[PDB]
Structure formats: C-alpha cells, structure tokens
Amino acid sequence: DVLLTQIPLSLPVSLGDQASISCRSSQSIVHSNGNTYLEWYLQKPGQSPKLLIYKVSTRFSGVPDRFSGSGSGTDFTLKISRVEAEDLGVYYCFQGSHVPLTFGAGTQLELKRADAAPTVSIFPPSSEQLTSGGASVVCFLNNFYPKDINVKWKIDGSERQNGVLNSWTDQDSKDSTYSMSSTLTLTKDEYERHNSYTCEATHKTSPIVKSFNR
Amino acid sequence: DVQLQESGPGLVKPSQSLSLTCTVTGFSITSPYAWNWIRQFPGNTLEWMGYISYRGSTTYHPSLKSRISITRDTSKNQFFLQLNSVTTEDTATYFCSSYGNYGAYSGQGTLVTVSAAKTTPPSVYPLAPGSMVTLGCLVKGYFPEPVTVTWNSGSLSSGVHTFPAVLQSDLYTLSSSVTVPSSTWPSETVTCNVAHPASSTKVDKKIVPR
Ligand SMILES: CN(Cc1cnc2[nH+]c(N)nc(N)c2n1)c1ccc(C(=O)N[C@@H](CCC(=O)O)C(=O)O)cc1
Numbered sequence: 301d302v303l304l305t306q307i308p309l310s311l312p313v314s315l316g317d318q319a320s321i322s323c324r325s326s327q328s329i330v331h332s333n334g335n336t337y338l339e340w341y342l343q344k345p346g347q348s349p350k351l352l353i354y355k356v357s358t359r360f361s362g363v364p365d366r367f368s369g370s371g372s373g374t375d376f377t378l379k380i381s382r383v384e385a386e387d388l389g390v391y392y393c394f395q396g397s398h399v400p401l402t403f404g405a406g407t408q409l410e411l412k413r414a415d416a417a418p419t420v421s422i423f424p425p426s427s428e429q430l431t432s433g434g435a436s437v438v439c440f441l442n443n444f445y446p447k448d449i450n451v452k453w454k455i456d457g458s459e460r461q462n463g464v465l466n467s468w469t470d471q472d473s474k475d476s477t478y479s480m481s482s483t484l485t486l487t488k489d490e491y492e493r494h495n496s497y498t499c500e501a502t503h504k505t506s507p508i509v510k511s512f513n514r
Numbered sequence: 515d516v517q518l519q520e521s522g523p524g525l526v527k528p529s530q531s532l533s534l535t536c537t538v539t540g541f542s543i544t545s546p547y548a549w550n551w552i553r554q555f556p557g558n559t560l561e562w563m564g565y566i567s568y569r570g571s572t573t574y575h576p577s578l579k580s581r582i583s584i585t586r587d588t589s590k591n592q593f594f595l596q597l598n599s600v601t602t603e604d605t606a607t608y609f610c611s612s613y614g615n616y617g618a619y620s621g622q623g624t625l626v627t628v629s630a631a632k633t634t635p636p637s638v639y640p641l642a643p644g645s646m647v648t649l650g651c652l653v654k655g656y657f658p659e660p661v662t663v664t665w666n667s668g669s670l671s672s673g674v675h676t677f678p679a680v681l682q683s684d685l686y687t688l689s690s691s692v693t694v695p696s697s698t699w700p701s702e703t704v705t706c707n708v709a710h711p712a713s714s715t716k717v718d719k720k721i722v723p724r
Contacts, residue, residue, distance in 0.1 A: 339618070348609055349560065351618045360617040392560065396613065400575040401562040421648035421691070426639040429652070436652055438641055440691045442675060465687065467677040474672070481677040481689045483652070512644040 302326055302395050304404035312412045312446075317383045321407045323376040323393035330373075330397065337396035340369055340378045343406075344389040345470055352391075353378065383409070413476040418444035422499045422510040425491060435491035437484040439499035439510065443477040451482040452507065454498040460484060516540030518610045518621035524712075525658055526600050526628050534595040536610030536621060543591055544568055548613040551584060551595045553606035554623070557678070561606075565613075566593055604628045627658045631684040635713040636661060638706065640721045641689075648693045649721045651706035655685040656713070663690040664707045670694065 303326035313319050323338070330336055338356045341349035351360040353369035356376060366381040380387060388411065393404040418441040425435035441449060447468075453460040463486065469479045482499065491514065498511040522534035536549070543549055548565040555561070564574035566584045574582050583596040597604060609623035634657045641650030653661055663676045673693040679686040694704060704721045 348620045348623045349554075350620065354613075354617045358617070394560075394562075399573060400577070401565075403560040403562070405559065419646075419648065419693070421650070422644070423641040423650060424644050426641065426652070429637070429639045429654075432637070434654075436639075436654065438650060438652055438689055440648060440650065440675070440689075442648070442691060442693070465680045465682060467680055467688070469675055469677060472675075479675040479677070479691075481675075481691070483687070483689060485682075 302398050302402050304393050306404035306407045311407055311409050313383045314412050319380040319383050321378045321391050325374040329395045338376050339394040341392040342389055410471055411476040413445055416445040416477055418442055418449055418501045420501050420508045420510040424512055430488050433488045435486045435488050437497050439482045441501045442479045445477045447478055450502045452500040452502050453484055455494045456496050516619045520610055520621045520624045528630055529599055531598045532600055532626055534608055536593045538591045543586055543593055546614045549593045550611045552609045552611055555606050600628045602628050631657045633713050635710050635715040638708045638717045638719045640719050642721050642723050646693050647696050647699050648691055649704055650691045652689050653708055654687045656710050657685050658712055659686055662709045665692045666705055
C-alpha cells in the first residue's frame with residue numbers, strides 16, 4: 301500500500317503567515333497513463349473534507365489563488381501564501397494512482413497565541429446521582445494553551461488513575477485555547493470510603509490544585 | 515447545483531450488514547469518472563472504501579473486498595454501499611463522493627454506529643460548586659450519539675465548553691461547563707438544556723447551590 305507521510309502533523313500559524321505542508325509518498329504515485337493523482341483536502345470542524353487541489357497542481361472550483369500544489373515522484377507540497385481565518389482546519393493529502401486509494405494522517409493548521417494556564421474547577425457528585433447509587437467527581441481544566449497540560453487526581457494523598465475518563469475540546473474559536481474534562485467514576489459506596497478529593501492541572505512543580513472534603 | 519446525499523440507518527447490530535444510499539443531483543452518475551464511498555473513524559483517519567465507475571465497474575479497498583459491495587441505479591441517479599459482517603470497528607461517519615476531470619464533490623456524511631447496545635436516554639446531573647463562577651452538567655449513560663447541550667437556550671454560549679463524548683462501556687458520557695460572573699449566579703437562573711433526539715428526550719436541569 302502507498303503510505304502518505306504528512307510533515308508536520310501540527311502547523312501552528314499566525315494570520316497572514318505563509319504556510320507549507322509536505323506530503324511524502326512511500327513509493328512513486330505516477331499512474332500507468334503518466335498522470336499523478338495527488339490531491340489536497342481541507343476539513344473544517346463538523347464539515348466533510350473539501351477538495352482544494354487535484355492532479356498535484358489543479359485548483360478545484362472556488363479555491364483561491366493563495367492555495368497552490370506542486371511536487372513530483374515522492375515529494376508533494378501544499379503552499380498557502382497568506383493564511384486567512386477561514387483556512388484553519390485539518391489538511392489531508394490523498395493519492396488515487398494505486399489501489400488502495402490512500403490519505404495522509406492530516407495536518408492541523410492551528411492559530412499560535414501566548415501560553416495560558418488553565419482554570420481548574422472541581423465538583424462533588426450531585427445529590428441526584430447519589431440517590432441512584434452513583435458518584436461521579438468532575439473536574440474542568442479550562443482555557444489553557446498549548447496542549448502541554450495534564451490532570452492528576454489524588455484521593456486522601458494517593459494518586460488515582462483507575463476509573464478516570466478524560467476528554468479534550470478542539471481549539472476554541474473564541475480565544476484559541478484548549479479545555480479538558482476529567483471524570484472520576486465511582487459508586488456512592490466507593491465515594492464514601494474517602495474524604496479529600498484533589499484535582500490538579502500539571503505541566504512537565506507548581507500544579508494548579510482544587511480540592512474538596514466529603 | 516451538484517449535491518451528493520447519504521441516507522440509511524444510523525444503527526447497525528454486530529454481524530448484521532450496513533446499507534447506505536447516495537442520492538445524486540446536479541449531474542448523472544453516468545458522468546466520468548468514479549463514484550466513491552469514504553469513511554472517517556471516530557476523531558480520525560479517512561479510508562477510501564471503494565468506487566463504482568461511470569460505466570458500472572467496481573474497485574474496492576482489498577481489505578474490505580469479501581464484505582463490500584458497491585452497486586448503482588442509473589435511472590434513480592443513486593449508488594449504494596453494502597458492508598456485510600460488521601464489527602464495532604465499523605463505527606464511522608460515512609460519506610459518498612465523486613471524482614473526475616473537474617475534481618471532486620463530497621456529501622455531508624452520516625454517523626453509522628455499530629453496537630449491541632440499545633437506545634437509552636441520558637441521566638442529566640447539575641454541577642454546582644462545593645469574580646467568575648464555573649458550573650456544569652453531567653450527561654451520563656446515553657446511546658447512541660448525539661446529544662445537544664445549550665445553556666439558557668443559547669444566551670450563555672460565550673463561556674461554554676461541551677466536551678466530546680467518551681464510550682464506557684457500551685454507553686456514552688459527556689460533560690458541559692459554563693462560566694458566568696459571580697454577580698449572575700446564584701442570583702439569576704442558570705439552566706442546562708439537554709436533547710437526545712434518538713430517544714426523543716429534552717431535559718432542562720437548573721443549577722442550584724449547596
Ligand atoms: C487511476 N485513477 C483513478 C482515480 C484517481 N483519482 C481519484 N481521486 C479520487 N478522489 N477518487 C477516485 N476514485 C480517484 N480515482 C484514474 C485513472 C484514469 C482516469 C481516466 O481515464 N479519466 C478520464 C479521462 C482520461 C483522460 O484524461 O483522457 C476518463 O474519462 O476516462 C481516471 C482516474
């Protein structure tokens with residue numbers, strides 16, 4: 301199978317910047333008719349991927365001139381001469397020259413900004429959930445930048461990892477920050493075995509700590 | 515003018531087969547060159563499943579060839595996808611697309627969930643704390659995806675984070691946060707509005723302190 305290597309996978313940019321994405325083919329993608337079916341797609345969130353460039357350098361209908369494709373053999377490049385607010389999303393390269401037809405892993409074109417520490421909020425289980433015999437402890441690590449932040453749970457001085465469910469949001473369109481939710485899933489009985497519940501935002505010292513006592 | 519519209523069931527039981535329809539408008543499926551079926555896995559990678567040409571000959575992803583069948587109805591201007599012995603690993607957003615000398619056109623895509631799980635509404639719980647104040651909503655144990663979360667019918671959208679759903683074990687769970695000034699809460703009403711269309715539910719949970 302033809303493997304497509306996209307370089308880089310994450311492209312941090314400022315509006316107005318010149319951007320370049322590379323697509324490296326594991327083998328030649330020249331079809332038996334001499335044509336190279338190398339395509340570039342842009343996927344915005346919620347939307348389906350939309351064609352930008354096909355046959356290496358042909359711009360699709362409605363595609364601006366700031367988007368251009370080039371390359372030969374195993375190295376293909378998508379260039380964005382001026383990054384606009386509407387150009388943000390995930391870029392994919394695709395080859396249709398050999399079966400199976402294949403895509404690259406996707407390049408996230410993301411907005412740069414200054415580092416931001418998260419806002420940590422901890423929530424004891426609700427009385428409504430306790431009545432059902434369940435006790436979920438929820439923590440939010442909101443509006444941080446870049447993705448370099450983690451969660452750490454401590455229950456009465458001991459690190460907790462089992463029963464922890466984490467989810468990260470995409471880059472926020474409001475301020476270019478990321479957010480994450482961490483839920484410690486316990487039964488009412490498990491929750492009653494412990495007193496002090498601690499949620500921390502960690503970095504590669506210094507953590508942002510939130511806690512409550514049962 | 516050109517439109518490719520996917521249709522079919524959103525839920526399929528494991529070992530059963532998924533069937534999807536692509537309804538084409540704007541031009542004929544008889545126009546060159548290929549009429550594709552593509553899938554995008556949860557938060558993921560894209561896979562070209564196969565295509566039927568303008569002349570009716572098929573080309574499949576070798577790994578799917580034995581389970582996959584792409585057919586067409588030239589007079590209805592539709593093409594079809596059949597994927598047989600389905601696994602939980604077939605859960606994806608399925609799109610139909612076209613390719614030719616003009617480039618490519620893509621449909622909007624529909625999520626097809628492959629699970630043994632049955633339709634369950636979520637349990638919605640308020641999250642009140644123990645200059646700004648963060649409140650939340652826990653939307654637990656629903657099936658299938660999706661749910662929609664709004665805060666005060668949308669007037670609070672500015673300081674809202676609705677986190678992606680996680681699957682455990684065969685049910686989905688999500689949370690949503692809202693941050694408002696300390697002046698606004700508990701003095702004024704903050705309500706979390708959750709809708710799960712599949713089970714026809716619409717719940718409104720108010721955030722009450724202590
Ligand atoms: C090898 N490819 C298949 C191919 C290429 N890129 C794709 N790109 C996408 N997005 N999807 C599919 N299915 C693709 N399939 C391929 C080869 C030759 C013709 C072809 O002969 N095209 C025209 C005209 C050929 C010509 O230029 O004379 C025809 O009408 O037959 C099309 C596609």
